[PDB]
Design a protein around this ligand. Structure first.
Ligand code: GTP
Ligand code: GTP
Ligand code: GDP
Ligand code: GDP
Ligand code: MG
Lengths: 51, 95, 430, 439, 433, 430
């Protein structure tokens, strides 16, 4: 079963965040990412912007 | 109280359905617009309603349609919910 | 030592490699940032087979990704373990072939293949001791069916002594997502039969059928199909990366499975596979493994293996087990199914055992069977080809870009001759 | 990095371009002012809107499409409307005198003085783009200016760019309904012109969509806007594969390699499913098998043509939503098992199916509801010949007694140009019947 | 994985469909608005899941008189039924079987067949078809004949069972109803697998004698019929120690293909004012069920021989009591079975007790019985209807109303000799060897 | 070693197996989770007779469940000890036979039996040393009476040397639940007499009489009947699973109880049977056990054993006891009832002793008797069959699905000949 009511009622709601990674590697300690959360079905996605 | 608006395949009479247009919408909306009176009546037009032609009377705006549609849905459902209880329905006396 | 490189092209090749590398990464215990976090010492002794060492202690696959459109590679960059690929290997076009073999093989593919050939040559020269190449494609797409086979030809022209493996997804009419499937399939097979040292066909109809009846899962997906294909892919090369009682490299398989140089088309199978409901219910034993192995329904192809006779068979077991039981079970099966085995070549079954089982499973089995039952797919593909070719349908695109109908006639004649000579040995008697 | 350029001509063309353009803005999140919202200040990713837009560097997005008309009323309305800040001011090309349903006026008299600026604007687009996938053209054929300008644009573009792909969404006159009286003439002339100049043409007849609306949408008095919304949804679903991630993608160049077997035979017919309004949409599951059955049902057609009266060559179905490939193949198996729908002896496999993950978007004030599964089919079958035959009969009824001919004689067109169109249609009729026979 | 499709045609058909579906929705617990009140595939017997929330009954309504359809779609079940499966035409046949068989029904039967295809494509384990129709009415009779003859060639071997309401010997509303009743019987004789008697006066006597309502209505009739239907169908969707399927009627109860008219009794019928003061024993409820006055068909089982009877027992019944009651029934001399049938009893057992409806008359009982029988005594209704039709056809009364609507003059005849042949078949079967 | 598999079909067979396997699990100390929880060492030595090993140390009953409808199996899966069965052994149809022998034996069963035959062949090949097969079914249902006997014929065609056991429930004329019982009973008996090595008849009327008179319990139930049948079944094969003074396998019983190959129909009984209110006062002794095993009312068949002469008898005792007492009691019983024993074959009583009694009981007895009194059931079945068939009623049902009246005539003639030749030996004298 897929709870269809939740995706009907919460499709337009999307949360966009700005985040920085933390990792052992030092090359990718400064670069930035934009995260997106779609609460229609709890989907988590990451975008990498290149300056 | 009825329900306001009717099932699509409803034969019968829905008052001023032929007099004052209501062209374009689905059918349930027209029935609702007619059952709760939101339209001009009469063979005359005050200045404001006229000169609002299709692409100028509609096919425009933005999220105001969100607001009106949401209010219509809320009012129609709060009108409908006036029925409950573990006694089924009085269709014995409705029939 | 005796390492190989991975080369994938087209959407299907890229997506197949996407989870093949994921399965290999899970087996070898590498993190998505390239940091080793395994538990066993054997996980690092033969890591050079698929991974190159870099400064900082990280590893990179020898994978080369090609396409005439960049969308599929920009998407595989998003999948898990997609940050292991070396960015220079990504080679993409700016136009796309539009499912056209002529576009993907004559004008745009020929011009584009220069850089990818340069990088492939660099990779082949860099490695210590080259064993061969493995190439994965589908015959339902124009850019794949053209560019992949042209690169097969170019690589064969430069490395005649090395071995070549092709992972071919042929279009079957049941899962027909394109109407020009058989033009491209026949044109790709015509070039592939000449150059590919080994080819193994995979059918999406068979994949979905497996998913519904064997695993009994209601919603099969591209991910499940790719996972099954990747497990079957790793089952072949597990023994080259892990120790075993009887090692058998891809060259030994080529020696023992191909009687005649033009008969190198295979269908495979993987065991065990069961639903979550029967995982505790079932028991893992050699008889169960071999009975699920040799079941006609378990084959990775829609072709019925009981409609023909097996020319040869190859088995790769994973896990610690006695060799006597394996030998006696194979002898018992070969005695009980003598009607389905060719008679003029006795003992047409090869056995190989590796002591390292896959992660999460105690015993595993890979079957590769060369049989005459594969003729049905070619017969139906040729029937569709001649039906669509008798009225010259959709040939204006192909004739407007440099190639003519004489090549079509030659391809059809060669494919029909291949089918006839493949079925000739079925009726041969001693 | 991929782009497609849309051209609209005629008032029908402009009001269908506007109709598809609010839908594109809605599904891309574009406000009428061009900012995404004012509220969302991160952005800077998921570049897919470049399929129809181009970034200004900071802020708004501009359309990759052109509006053309010699009747400036519609362009004046558009530049007055709520989207006045969206389109470029100089990209809405408007003339002074309407052709007034005269193909001669639009092809020989007044279209030449405006087609130059049109081609200039086309070049001013083509120089900006780098991965142009192709061109789309929208034109009403029952009108002289639309037909003439479309024919002229196709003729110049076929030599200006050469091999580039063009798709034309034409709306031929009804089998027995007409809003004008001289439309057979200009329709036949335009068909003759575009036959060797368009790569693919698509049927968009009006009574078929009228029947669709009255039967499915339950709207007993629809207007043209609803038909525009349906056509807009069709083309948006068609282009969704180029801007949305899908496990089985299809490109614009993957169209006439799969639906056009001879270069002359390139007329396609489209059906959609499901078409249902909200108050009864949620009542059933809308299974993939039943939506595919409805799509292939003859009465669900957007062209007034009977597929049972003709022989099928090849069909392309495209799904958007959460569809399952093996469910698709099982539906295709049932379609093949069905008897009344038959595929030709020289085409055993005739299915071109594409899959996309993005569900269709619901439009405010529209008729359709929000669904998680949608199918659209584009078909080539021999049933096309009936509309051509009836149009030929109607045109012959007038050319027998030379009615209305002076209105084309006096505007630069010589007398004989009706002939080659007539024999062209006749030759295509024999070509259709020749293709339709088995070996 | 099992499904069945119900068709209701005519005013009587739609009115009995409402009564059956109210009982069905009550017993399955689904709300009148269609949503699950919230809390195992049993609802798949009659309903289909939309995926999330409400359900769809597998039923269709057909009528040419839109009054009843409008009443239904304005009632409390407006949200429950699909808007475009309650097919309503324009002009009623007005008791004229020819109007509904040759002039008007053809233009609506195509839409009905399309709806049947659409609903049947969803079902995968379709057991068969149930049909409800008033034969004493023109549109109901004509549409029933048309649908039966279309389905018989559209599907063939698929089972169809019809709950026909034949006219009473003396009490009737119509006067032209003998004509259309005879014509519809002629039509359905070779097109219906099982036909069930539902004459009105018998249930009238049942209600007066047992329910103790001196002034009941048609809705009480419909509720009793609904209870009978729910009993006969509960075996498919409720677990039982001895289950009986729809396919297990034409494999136990139809000795010869022509003899398929079947008559049913039920028990217990008692109001709550005295329902609890009796233990309601299985033996006495079985005796009441076979009691001739407890019959829902105005027929005398004493006047004829028995061929085959099937009882369903719902509740906490025990097979030892079942067999003990059957032994006593066989022991009684007032009921005799035909010579060539040593055993003719078929028993089914279900654990689910009947559900009581609020505002109804029947009380809550832990045990119930429904018996469906084939016996030779049915021939009297056919004989009297034959006499009723002959008295009119002697002077060709009312004939022009049928001639002018597309039928030829002689189409009454083949129905007449068909009834005659069916009769002589009944007496030929009824004699011993 | 010398182990047997279980196969059940039909609702009645499924219900019988549901209690038989529960009784076996309780005797062997097997929990419903398949985990051994017994106390004695002897409970595990010969558990391979009915249980196979799986990974994790769990045990499985190798029973194959077949039906044309899934309701009975979907209901028994949720019952106690229902998780032991492998899901792979469950095979079900989607249409049903409607109690029709034509549907159960010609149209649906012939097509459906392929999978159950495959799994039965797999199970038979898997076991170390096959002893035979046992089937439980009822003759009152069409699908069972068809599919079970067709499977019997198919299994006999493939394993002519193995032994066959059938537990047949025949529809008695007193307690009748189906109107078409005589037709399918005759059709099933006609095929069963040809192929069954041993058949044991069980009557619901006799079970109910036993429950009403001996146990004196108010409400007999199918659960109690299934428990009695399960105890009777376990009494036969107890000696093969547990040590005893004189072991006697099913083959030895076949040798010692069947004088002529066509006389293999038996009637059985179990002792002791006492009410819950009468357990103390009775003393478990060999004289009590024999006077109860030879009681007419203790028989599980409504046929009167004093209306004929016993051809042979067999008794299996459970519990530790002296053999001299058993022999002298058998001699006394044979001498005191010489009029009811055939005279031309002396010493027609076989006795076997097992040292392991049933759980909860100190001593037990299973009796199997081949006598001429079984003719009455066949006579009444044939009388009902001919009374129903003389008027060709209920016949177009069968004739429209491929059969004809000549098969019915041959079946009736064969039944009459069998009855005549069974009663012929009753009047034979030396
Ligand atoms: N479906 C649809 N068809 C339209 C619409 N507008 C116009 N048409 C068709 O267009 C035909 C006539 O051409 P028009 O679009 O009105 O005008 P035109 O093509 O610009 O040519 P002129 O009339 O000379 O200005 C009519 O026969 C209609 O069938 C529309 O909004 N929707
Ligand atoms: N038992 C029962 N009989 C009914 C009911 N309604 C109508 N009838 C019978 O049907 C007969 C007349 O047919 P109707 O049902 O009224 O109408 P119809 O069947 O739709 O056919 P037309 O008369 O042509 O409209 C009457 O004589 C009644 O005996 C009902 O609700 N219950
Ligand atoms: N295993 C698997 N096969 C796929 C997937 N997507 C498409 N295919 C198969 O690939 C073939 C089509 O290849 P195509 O995309 O046209 O190749 P391309 O033109 O090179 O991109 C079809 O036969 C599909 O069955 C997937 O996600 N997984
Ligand atoms: N002992 C016993 N007999 C049963 C049970 N259930 C049904 N029966 C008998 O089986 C007969 C009906 O068999 P049936 O269900 O038609 O067999 P099927 O057609 O193979 O499913 C009845 O006469 C019952 O006496 C049970 O649980 N236990
Ligand atoms: Mg205009």
């Amino acid at each position: 079963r897929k709870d269809i009511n939740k995706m009907y009622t919460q499709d337009q709601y999307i949360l966009r965040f700005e985040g920085k990674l933390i990792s052992q590697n030092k090359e990718d300690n400064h670069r930035k990412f934009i995260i997106s959360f779609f609460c229609g079905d709890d989907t988590i996605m990451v975008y990498e912007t290149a300056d | 109280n009825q329900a306001k608006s009717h099932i699509p395949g409803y034969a019968g009479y829905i008052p001023g359905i032929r007099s004052e247009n209501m062209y374009g919408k689905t059918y349930g909306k027209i029935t609702y617009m007619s059952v709760t009176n939101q339209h001009h009546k009469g063979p005359d037009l005050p200045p404001d309603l006229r000169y609002t032609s299709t692409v100028k009377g509609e096919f425009t705006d933005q999220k105001g349609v969100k607001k009106q549609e949401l209010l219509r849905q809320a009012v129609i459902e709060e009108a409908k919910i006036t029925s409950s209880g573990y006694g089924s329905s009085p269709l014995r006396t409705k029939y | 030592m005796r390492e190989i490189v991975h080369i994938q092209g087209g959407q299907c090749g890229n997506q197949i490699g996407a989870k093949f590398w994921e399965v290999i990464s899970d087996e070898h215990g590498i993190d998505p940032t390239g940091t080793y976090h395994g538990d066993s010492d054997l996980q690092l002794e033969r890591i050079n087979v698929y991974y190159n060492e870099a400064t900082g202690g990280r590893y990179v696959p020898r994978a080369i990704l090609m396409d005439l459109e960049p969308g599929t590679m920009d998407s595989v960059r998003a999948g898990p373990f997609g940050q292991l690929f070396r960015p220079d290997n990504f080679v993409f076009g700016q136009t796309g072939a539009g499912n056209n073999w002529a576009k993907g093989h004559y004008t745009e593919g020929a011009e584009l293949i220069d850089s990818v050939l340069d990088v492939v040559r660099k990779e082949a020269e860099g490695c210590d001791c080259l064993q061969g190449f493995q190439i994965t494609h589908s015959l339902g797409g124009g850019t794949g069916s053209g560019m992949g086979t042209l690169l097969i030809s170019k690589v064969r022209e430069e490395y005649p002594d090395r071995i070549m493996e092709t992972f071919s997804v042929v279009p079957s009419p049941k899962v027909s997502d394109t109407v020009v499937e058989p033009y491209n399939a026949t044109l790709s097979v015509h070039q592939l039969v000449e150059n590919a040292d080994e080819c193994m066909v995979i059918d999406n109809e068979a994949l979905y059928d497996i998913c519904f009846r064997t695993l009994k899962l209601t919603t099969p997906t591209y991910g499940d199909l790719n996972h099954l294909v990747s497990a079957a892919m790793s089952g072949v090369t597990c023994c080259l990366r892990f120790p075993g009682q009887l090692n058998s490299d891809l060259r030994k398989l080529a020696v023992n499975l191909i009687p005649f140089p033009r008969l190198h088309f295979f269908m495979i199978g993987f065991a065990p596979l069961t639903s979550r409901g029967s995982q505790q219910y079932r028991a893992l034993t050699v008889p169960e493994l071999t009975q699920q192995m040799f079941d006609a329904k378990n084959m990775m192809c829609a072709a019925d293996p009981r409609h023909g006779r097996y020319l040869t068979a190859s088995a790769l077991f994973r896990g610690r087990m006695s060799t006597k039981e394996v030998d006696e079970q194979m002898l018992n099966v070969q005695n009980k199914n003598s009607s389905y085995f060719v008679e003029w070549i006795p003992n047409n079954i090869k056995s190989s055992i590796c002591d390292i089982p896959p992660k999460g499973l105690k015993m595993a089995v890979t079957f590769v069977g060369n049989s005459t039952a594969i003729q049905e797919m070619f017969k139906r593909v040729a029937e569709q080809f001649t039906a669509m070719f008798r009225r010259k349908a959709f040939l204006h695109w192909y004739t407007g870009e440099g190639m003519d109908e004489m090549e079509f006639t030659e391809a059809e004649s060669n494919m029909n001759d291949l089918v006839s000579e493949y079925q000739q040995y079925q009726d041969a008697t001693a | 990095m991929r782009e497609v350029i849309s051209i609209h001509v005629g008032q029908g063309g402009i009001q269908v371009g506007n109709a598809c353009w609010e839908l594109f803005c809605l599904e891309h999140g574009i406000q009428p002012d061009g900012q995404m919202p004012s509220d969302k200040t991160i952005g800077g990713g998921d570049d897919a809107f470049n399929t129809f837009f181009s970034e200004t560097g900071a802020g708004k997005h501009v359309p990759r499409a052109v509006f053309l008309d010699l009747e400036p009323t519609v362009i004046d309305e558009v530049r007055t409307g709520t989207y006045r800040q969206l389109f470029h001011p100089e990209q809405l090309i408007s003339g002074k005198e309407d052709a007034a349903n005269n193909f001669a006026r639009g092809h020989y008299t007044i279209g030449k003085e405006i087609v130059d600026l049109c081609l200039d604007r086309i070049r001013k687009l083509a120089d900006n783009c780098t991965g142009l996938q192709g061109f789309l053209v929208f034109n009403s054929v029952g009108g002289g200016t639309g037909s003439g300008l479309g024919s002229l644009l196709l003729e110049r573009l076929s030599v200006d760019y050469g091999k580039k792909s063009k798709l034309g969404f034409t709306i031929y006159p009804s089998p027995q309904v007409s809003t004008a009286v001289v439309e057979p003439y200009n329709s036949i002339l335009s068909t003759h012109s575009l036959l060797e100049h368009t790569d693919v043409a698509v049927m968009l007849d009006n009574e078929a969509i009228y029947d669709i609306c009255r039967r499915n949408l339950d709207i007993e008095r629809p207007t043209y806007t609803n038909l525009n919304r349906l056509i807009a949804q069709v083309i948006s679903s068609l282009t969704a594969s180029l801007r949305f991630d899908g496990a089985l993608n299809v490109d614009i160049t993957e169209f006439q390699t799969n639906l056009v077997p001879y270069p002359r035979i390139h007329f396609m017919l489209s059906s959609y499913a499901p078409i249902i309004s909200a108050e009864k949409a949620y009542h059933e599951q809308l299974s993939v098998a039943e939506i595919t059955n409805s799509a292939f049902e003859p009465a669900n057609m957007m062209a007034k043509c009977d597929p049972r009266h003709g022989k099928y060559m090849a069909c392309s179905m495209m799904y958007r939503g959460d569809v399952v490939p093996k469910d698709v193949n099982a539906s295709i198996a049932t379609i093949k098992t069905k008897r009344t729908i038959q595929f030709v002896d020289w085409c055993p496999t005739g299915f071109k199916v594409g899959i996309n993950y993005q569900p269709p978007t619901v439009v405010p004030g529209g008729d359709l509801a929000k669904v998680m599964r949608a199918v659209c089919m584009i078909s080539n079958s021999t049933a096309i010949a009936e509309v051509f035959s009836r149009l030929d009969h109607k045109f012959d009824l007038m050319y027998a007694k030379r009615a209305f001919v002076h209105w084309y004689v006096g505007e630069g067109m010589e007398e004989g140009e009706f002939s080659e169109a007539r024999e062209d249609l006749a030759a295509l009729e024999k070509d259709y019947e020749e293709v339709g026979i088995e070996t």
